[PDB]
Amino acid sequence: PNHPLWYTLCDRYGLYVVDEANIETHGMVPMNRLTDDPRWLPAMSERVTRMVQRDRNHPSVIIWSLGNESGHGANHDALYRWIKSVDPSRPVQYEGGGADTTATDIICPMYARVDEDQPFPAVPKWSIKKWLSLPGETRPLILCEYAHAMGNSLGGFAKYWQAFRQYPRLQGGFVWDWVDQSLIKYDENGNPWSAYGGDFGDTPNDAQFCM
Amino acid sequence: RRDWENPGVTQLNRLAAHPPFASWRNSEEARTDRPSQQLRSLNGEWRFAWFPAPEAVPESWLECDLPEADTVVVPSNWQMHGYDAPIYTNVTYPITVNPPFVPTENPTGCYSLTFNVDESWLQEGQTRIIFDGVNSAFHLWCNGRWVGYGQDSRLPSEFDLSAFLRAGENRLAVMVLRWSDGSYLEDQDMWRMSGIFRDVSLLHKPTTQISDFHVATRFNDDFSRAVLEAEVQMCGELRDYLRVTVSLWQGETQVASGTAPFGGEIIDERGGYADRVTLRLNVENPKLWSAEIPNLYRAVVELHTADGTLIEAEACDVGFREVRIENGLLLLNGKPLLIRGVNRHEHHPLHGQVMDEQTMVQDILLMKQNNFNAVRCSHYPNHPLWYTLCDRYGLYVVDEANIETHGMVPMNRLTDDPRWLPAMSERVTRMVQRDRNHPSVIIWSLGNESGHGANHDALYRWIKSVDPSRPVQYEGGGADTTATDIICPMYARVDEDQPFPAVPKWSIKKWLSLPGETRPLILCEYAHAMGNSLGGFAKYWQAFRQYPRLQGGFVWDWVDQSLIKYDENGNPWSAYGGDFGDTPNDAQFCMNGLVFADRTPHPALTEAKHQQQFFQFRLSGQTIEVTSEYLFRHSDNELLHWMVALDGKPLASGEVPLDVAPQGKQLIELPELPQPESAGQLWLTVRVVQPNATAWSEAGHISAWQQWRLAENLSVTLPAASHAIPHLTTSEMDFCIELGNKRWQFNRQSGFLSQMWIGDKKQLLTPLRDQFTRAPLDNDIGVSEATRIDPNAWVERWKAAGHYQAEAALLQCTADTLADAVLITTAHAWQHQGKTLFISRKTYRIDGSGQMAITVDVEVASDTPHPARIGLNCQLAQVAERVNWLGLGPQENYPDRLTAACFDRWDLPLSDMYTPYVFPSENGLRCGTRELNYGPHQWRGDFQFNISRYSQQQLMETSHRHLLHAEEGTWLNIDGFHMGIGGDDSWSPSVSAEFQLSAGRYHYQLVWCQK
Amino acid sequence: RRDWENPGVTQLNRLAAHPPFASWRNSEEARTDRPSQQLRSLNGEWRFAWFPAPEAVPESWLECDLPEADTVVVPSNWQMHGYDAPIYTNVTYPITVNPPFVPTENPTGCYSLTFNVDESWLQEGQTRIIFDGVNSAFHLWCNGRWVGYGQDSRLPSEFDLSAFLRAGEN
Ligand SMILES: O=C1O[C@H](CO)[C@H](O)[C@H](O)[C@H]1O
Ligand SMILES: [Mg+2]
Ligand SMILES: [Mg+2]
Ligand SMILES: [Mg+2]
Ligand code: NA
Ligand code: NA
Ligand code: NA
Ligand code: NA
Ligand code: NA
Ligand code: NA
DSSP, X not given: OOOTHHHHHIIIIIOOEEEEXXXXXXTSSSTTTTTTOGGGHHHHHHHHHHHHHHHTTOTTEEEEEOOSSOOOOHHXXXXXXXXXXXXXXXXXXXXXXXXXXXXXXXXXXXXOOXXXXXXXXXXXXXXXXXXXXXXTOOOOEEEEEESOOOSSOOTTHHHHHHHHHHOTTEEEEEESOSSOOOEEEXXXXXXXXXXXXXXXXXXXXXXXXXX | OOGGGOTTOSEESOOOOOSOOOOBSSHHHHHHTOOOTTEEEOOXXXXXXXXXXXXXXXXXGGTSOOTTOEEEEESOOGGGGTSSOOEEESSSOSSOSBTTBXXXXXXXXXXXXXXXXXXXXXXXXXXXXXXXXXXSEEXXXXXXXXXXXXXXXXXXXXXXXXXXXXXXXXXXXEEEESOOGGGGGBOOSEEEOOBOOSOEEEEEEOSSEEEEEEEEEEEOTTSSEEEEEEEEEEESOOOTTEEEEEEEEETTEEEEEEEEESOOOOOBTTBOOTTEEEEEEEEESOOBBOSSSBOOEEEEEEEEETTSOEEEEEEEEEOBOOEEEETTEEEETTEEOOEEEEEOOOOBTTTBTOOOHHHHHHHHHHHHHXXXXXXXXXXXXXXXXXXXXXXXXXXXXXXXOSOBOTTSSSTTTTTTOGGGHHHHHHHHHHHHHHHTTOTTEEEEEOOSSOOOOHHHHHHHHHHHHHOTTSOEEOOTTTSSSTTOSSBOOBSOOSSOOBOOSSSOBOOHHHHHTSTTOOSOEEEEEESOOOSSOXXXXXXXXXXXXXXXXXXXXXXXXXXXXXXXXXXXXXXXXXXXXXXXXXXXXXXXXXXXXXXOTTOOBOTHHHHHHHHTOSEEEEEETTEEEEEEOOSSOOOTTOEEEEEEEETTEEEEEEEEEOOOOTTOEEEEEOOOOOOOSSOEEEEEEEEEEEOSOOSSOOTXXXXXXXXXXXXXXXXXXXXXXXXSOOEEEEOSSEEEEEETTEEEEEETTTOSEEEEEETTEEOEEEEEEEEOOOOOOHHHHOOSSTTOOOTTSHHHHHHHHTTTTOEEEEEEXXXXXXXXXXXXXXXXXXXXXXXXXXXXXXXXXXXXXXOEEEEEEEEEOTTSOOOSEEEEEEEESOOOSEEEEEEEESSOOBTTBOSSOEEEEEEEEGGGGSOOOSSOOSOOOEEEEEEEEETTEEEEEEEEEEEESSOHHHHHHOSSGGGOOOOSSEEEEEEEEEOOOOOSOSSSOOOOGGGSOOSSEEEEEEEEEEO | OOGGGOTXXXXXXXOOOOSOOOOOXXXXXXXXXXXXXXXXXXXXXXXXXXXXXXXXXXXXXXXXXXXXXXXXXXXXXXXXXXXXXOOOOSSSOSSOOOTTOOOXXXXXXXXXXXXXXXXXXXXXXXXXXXXXXXXSEEEEEETXXXXXXEEOTTSOEEEEOTTTOOSSOO
């Protein structure tokens, strides 16, 4: 959940917002170890319910998100239903566990390619055109993350947009991401320079992967 | 920190819930389910001290035993020991509604125990203590050191004591609080007690252990093949040498087995569960489990090293069955179920809410003997043994979460509050985690009467997610919300709608077809058996059998929640609300069972057994069509016994072997019956007898029966000629008729028969008078809260109309001497405040044979509430030992509750003609009676009657059966007509129109003579 | 009670969540969305002291300012002021994965602020304190008395201070 003023600005300047609960357990093994554990349901539910209770009147918020990279747990299904019950005005999405589980109204993969499949075991990232028509599937597809803009990047960006425009159910996505997470540091001469992972003695760290 | 006033803290240091563990260290023992040395019981004599509040408990108690304490038995409810009073309140909370706060004066029970621990348990593995039930919250200490905290009174709380124990003597200190924020979720309609009411045990597990395991059974289209999947979870040192072996047994024969190392399949980008493994075993033509035939297999889960070293083994009984809802029908192994269920609380008249095996077994045997096949755990998870028993004897179970917030306003104030979601989820999730392997459990319930909140939807989905093998139901908020797979209303009537705002209770037939509705309907509660009740019960079962989607319901309920008290002479008597100084209270509304607290049946139990029969019959000429409502079993322990009798006189009889396939039919043509000599009605009575004893019944057990009127030959022969002629003697005050040794006396002032003489003795203590009222039944009083007096209740309407105060006004009284008899004509009018309620016109014809023909014709004002009865009553001077009659019996039966009774010649001791309802009311009636015999007297005609030593007046003025005193002589009530008793619920008029005496004009005739 | 190592305790005495409030006492001010005198900002210069673990925090800190504390701007992340190093890791947790436990060495930031309220606030009404964001958990004290606890670094944590306030400096 963002600083309260962000939603007011989006309401006024006009930007569609996906409000996401502060829940990410990426480092767990497997990713859903905690989210599928009934003992963590209470902590998770407050992160979802208190978000909804705070931002439910903002017109800019058009979609609720259960969080990020926490696999797919029964806690997600429970909280998904909680929202649908409390606020039927907004669709609920969540990418964890395969991007098309029972906890999301929208097929929302991260980095699924336009034409090329990535048949990872359990959590495959199908070509987005193919994903749409898998037997039984009918939901819309909007990538929660795509076109990773790390450094000299965004190659193949036009391929996505040609697809978004030709396929009615391919409704876009959110580029990753807006601003480099670099921090300022000063050399002996007092001159500032852009720093990243490990430049503060922090270790282990993931170097430039924060930009 | 006052954790007992924080819905955010429902436990501290409590271990995760799981299925029943015994930690066997020998596979064979696990297979045979014999005792486990690793599982000890700490039940027995403990120390106990009561305190008005926790702040009163002295610090010394934590380290040393309190001198003031007493030695009591555990498990037990401390109210049953007299430390404080048990409180019976229905809806209104026993404490002020100010969540999450509880009264500062909070009864606190300090339990303590000194016990031994073998050094062997502390040298390796983990030693935990398990409290199966503590009401309602508690703190634990071991040897002076604080261990943990827990809430929810109906599920086990476990704690690791490995680092607190010492070899030899140890001391536990448990401070149990009566009230806690947990109480807000425990407002069930029952006695509010407290203490350590369930088993306390010590379990020892290896460091590398089985921490959890789930068993599932999937089938192919025709159930000719199955796959048993067992997911096993472990804790501790994870190594490549570890393995899990799940073997399935049928008796001593291993039918299947699978072995595998840990490391589940990949589930997400981070991999899978390295601490889990799933074994899949193929089973061909498995023996399916059902309440009809509870086939069970034994599954043994072995944790071991690849090379053969057993670390530990766990196990459970596996019932191969599939529960699914398809096309609107609840199916068991592919067949539509017809739920013959009942709600059952855990109650004992002496021990309170503490359950024991014998009581559980008795209940199950009684339930199955009375054709019940299902039970609902109203309204909390039960004692662990209950499920094992239901698995083995065969009963479908609805496992219900310990959540009820009935007293809140509105009912969903807390269930719709996300801040209460945590406390609620634990009551649901821990239940499922504990009972998911029991085959007997076929449906999960989210709780009872807590309205409908978002929390319910969240938890509904949580269960659908973790356990897709069982349907989920919940009645709150309308009985058909998004939180239930089954339309499960309570007290919805068969044909009549009750359009309550927001939460209407539609007629069940109409409910099924509401636009868009497709779900099956099974009432979670119906046919309230409070006192003299269950009228209209047959109407439900006729509908259940005609409507596919009406699949039954659970009667409310199994046993009266009465407690035993003692008088000055030390004699026991049944007590209810308010009998312990408890107030506010809801008096007798805690007694709604088909059986008494001591399990003695109420008359209504036979009505239930009859309507719930598994065999249906139809007659056509000499042929009896038998249909089986069994879904799986054949009638391989049933024989049909038939009997034809003429007005109680046996003419013919015989038996035929029953051989009908489930859902099948069998035709049985009866022999060429011999045309009877005497005049009268021939009656055919058939009954299904179980030749062989079973695990739930004795040899000869009768499971079903049905009666039919056969040929009837009306008597056209006139009785012999009378020798003498009755003589009339007149005085201003009376008309006295004499014929031999017999004398009749009619008071000319009252207009009633005031006396009769048979030989040299008088026969009446009170004159024979009209009666239009009855001691009000609980259904007539119609209240569920001792504070609400519904003016619409039958008793209130009769009282306001003056039925109980109307006095008889004589309009006519004349005598006439005929050729061979004397005729007495009378007319009375009952009035109240210038309003004529009833008019009774009679004639008494006493002829030369010594018989008195009484013809009665009554008019009832159309605008006065329909009368409870239309008959006569009097107090006979004598008391006989037996009561003999030709009519419906042998047990008590009323107009809307008499399908179970059979027409025949019955003979019972006087005492059996009185039903001992704890709260006294009209009782013991028997209908369709053509002849009644008592002492020298005989009454003939077509009436209903009850006979006892208690007058309607005494019954009406007495609150407890033990306060009744036999009156002199015998009170007789003979009715031409009697109102139905109803019972669809006991807090509103529930007697169907067809059983209301609204005809305006009534006629009945009786012949009184000597036998 | 080490509430920061128990997922069963995500807060203590925290008020219920709700949409943005200002408690306008004038309808036109609310319509125009102008400022509300009933809503005060406490952003500015606070007193801060860093500690390697909560056990290192001196009980004296609850009663009066710590001499070794510095004056810093709030809101802010103490890493940006140089009290300790910000850490950049993608997937792998920055602490040993052993739920619900965290390191015994747990950087602790002790913030404090002396203030006072309008006389009428001491008279009637409910006065609450709102922390729009605290990373990652915290205990709150007012005039030396414990008020509450709260988690979740990205949503506001509110507490009723009504029964703690007093005339003069708080
Ligand atoms: O609706 C109900 O009716 C019964 C009345 O005896 C009893 O109170 C049950 O617990 C409740 O669910
Ligand atoms: Mg609590
Ligand atoms: Mg209730
Ligand atoms: Mg915590
Ligand atoms: Na598109
Ligand atoms: Na990154
Ligand atoms: Na049916
Ligand atoms: Na009741
Ligand atoms: Na048979
Ligand atoms: Na009475």
